[PDB]
Amino acid sequence: MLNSNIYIIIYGGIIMYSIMIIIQMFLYNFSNKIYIEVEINKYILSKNNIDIYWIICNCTIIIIITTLNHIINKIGIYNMIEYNICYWLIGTGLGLYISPFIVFGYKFFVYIMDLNNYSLNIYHNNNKMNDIQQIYNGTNYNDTMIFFIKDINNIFTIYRSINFFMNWLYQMIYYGVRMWLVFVLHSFSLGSFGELITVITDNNLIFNVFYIGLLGLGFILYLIVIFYLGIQIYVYISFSLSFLHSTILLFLVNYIPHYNNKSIFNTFTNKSIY
C-alpha cells in the first residue's frame, strides 16, 4: 500500500542491563560527592550551586558505574558501551553541556538576548552620549543603513552572542572523542599484541606455557587497565569542570560586599511623606 511507510528499529538487550545501573547507585551512594562539592565551591558561589552539583554527581557516578561494569561485569552492552561514540557524545557529554543552561538558563538567555543588541562595554560608564546613542540609535555603533542588510545581521548577531558559549560545546565534543579514541585504540592495540604473542607461542609450543604465571600477568594487567582508565576518567572530569569554570561560570561572578545597615527599627515609607 501507499500510505504504509515502514521503519525498522534495531532492539536488543536494554532493560535488564539498564536496571542494574540505577540499582547500583544505592551501593555506591555518591562517593564522588565530596570531590564535586570541593570543585563547585572552588569555581562558583551562588544559591543554585546544589542544582549543578547534583547534576554533575549523577553524570559522573553514571560514568564510573558504566566503566566498572565495563571492566568487571562483561556481558553484552557493557563491553561496547565505552567503545562506542554515541555513549561518549550523548550519555556523558550532552548532560554536562546542558547542565549550566538548565541551572542558569534564565541569566544566560537574558544575556544573549541583550548581546543581540550589540554594544561597546564601557567601564565606569558615566557618559551621557553613550546613553543617547544606546536609546535613540539602539547601539553605541553607527546603525545607519544596516536595515538594508538586516537579513544576515540577525543571525550573525545571534552567533556573536553565543560565540562565548560555543567553546564549551567544542571542548565537550573534543574530550568525548578523546575518551572514545583512548578506550578503542588501547583495547585494540592490547588485543593485537596478545594475538601476535599467542601466534608465536602456538607455532612454538615450547613457549606455549604460562610463562609469566597464571595470576601474575592477570593481576598486572588488571592494575594497568584500572590505573590507566582511572587516570583518564579523572582527566575527563577535572578538565570538564575546569573548562566549565573558565568558559561559562566566569559570567556569573557577582561579588556583593557587605554593607552595614543603620535604620533597622524604622523604615521610611510613602505614608511618611505623603
Binding site: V110, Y111, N163, L169, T247, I248, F251, V253, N254
Partner: protein, 66 residues
Amino acid sequence: MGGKASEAVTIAFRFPHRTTFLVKQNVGQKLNKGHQTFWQLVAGGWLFFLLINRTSFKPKLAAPKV
C-alpha cells in the same frame, strides 16, 4: 574554536543596575478622564471586523447534484 567567558564581560557587568522605586506626588493628573464611550465603540469595531471576516462552513455545496 569559539570564545570563552574569560574573553567577555559578565552578567553583572551587563545589567549592573539594581532596582529603584520611583514615586511622584499626586497633583490631580489622573482625573477628568474623557472619552467615556470609547470602549463600547472599540468593541463594536472589533465585532464588526469579526463579522466581515466571518465565514460559515457551507457543506451543501458538496451535494451530489450530478
